[PDB]
Every structure is written in structure tokens, then in C-alpha cells.
Assembly symmetry: C2
């Protein structure tokens, strides 16, 4: 019961960070491996200003990590809890089915 | 070799993903709430009534009814009555799998 409240708060904080169509798209792409910002901006329909904000949100939530290789910025999953949620709501569509 | 249907089968479709992402986005929006999440966990064990939910959770004497109504308007819970007994159940199988994933092990 008191353990439920602790689990409920951590879970809801995780779902809050994932309850966004654009962010969910980024997670899915990153489920198939590390990808750069231009790769995601190329794949994602919306404007690149929205992509970088969604990336910044996923990063400050600890749900993705980044690294720089010169002028390139690469992003990867960095959270096993979020990967399982993404895997569940997509029904392994990002795994390649 | 080189068929359209074949190279399409092997290529992940970004717009089918967009369709799934929006539906999953709406599902997580309905669940990204601590109070509603706790209701979902209790209902994952089985059918439970409103007053035994208010008994078990007790966020406040009126917040359970508010969160139950919102879970119902989103299609995640179901309602039925036997006189003085309102029986609520987990109606959406997609939400059940999300609850099972985040509550790895806790409800059922
Ligand atoms: Cl937006």
C-alpha cells in the first residue's frame, strides 16, 4: 500500500515523460540503435525546432543520453524502464516486429 | 528480387509508427497520473467497487470519484451496478499491459 504509492509516483513520472506523440516517435527510432540529431530531423516530419525541444525534454528526464563527435550529436536510449514501456505500447513494432 | 512489396515488408514504415504513436500517446496521457495509476493497479487484481477503492486508497473523499470518472471517459475502466454496489473493472487491455509493465510485478 505504502509501497504502491512509491511505485505509482515513479511510474507516473515515467509516463508523463513519455505521454507525447513526438517524443514517443523519437524513443521508437532510438529503439533500433543510436541515431544523430540530423538523422532524426530527417526522419521526423515536424520542424527541427520541435525535435530539439523533444530531445531536450527526453534528456532532462533521463530517458535519453547524448554524445558529441565533432559537429554531430548522437542520441541513445539510456533508460531500461522507458524502453519497456515503449516496447509495450508499440507491441514490439520498433523491434522490427 | 527488388519487388515493391518485398522492400516494403523489410522497411519500417514511419507513418504506421506515427499512427501507433498517437494512439499510444493518448493512452499514456490518460495513465500519467499517480492517483489514476493507483486505481489501475487495484483493478488489475480484479473487479473492485468504488467504496472499497475509497477504502483502500483514500487520497480524499472526492478525488477517487473524479479520477474514476476520467478513467471511464477515456475508456480505460468499465462500470456496473448491483443496487448499492458500483463495480468497476479494467476495460482496456492496452492499459492493462502498460500497468503490468510499469508495475513490473506489484498488482498481478
Ligand atoms: Cl508539440
Amino acid at each position: 500500500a505504502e509501497e504502491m504509492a512509491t511505485r505509482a509516483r515513479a511510474a507516473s513520472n515515467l509516463l508523463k515523460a513519455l505521454a507525447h506523440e513526438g517524443r514517443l516517435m523519437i524513443m521508437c527510432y532510438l529503439a533500433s540503435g543510436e541515431k544523430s540529431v540530423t538523422e532524426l530531423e530527417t526522419r521526423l516530419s515536424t520542424r527541427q525546432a520541435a525535435v530539439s525541444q523533444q530531445l531536450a525534454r527526453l534528456r532532462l528526464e533521463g530517458l535519453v543520453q547524448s554524445r558529441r563527435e565533432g559537429k554531430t550529436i548522437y542520441y541513445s536510449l539510456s533508460d531500461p524502464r522507458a524502453a519497456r514501456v515503449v516496447q509495450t505500447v508499440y507491441e514490439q513494432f520498433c523491434s522490427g516486429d
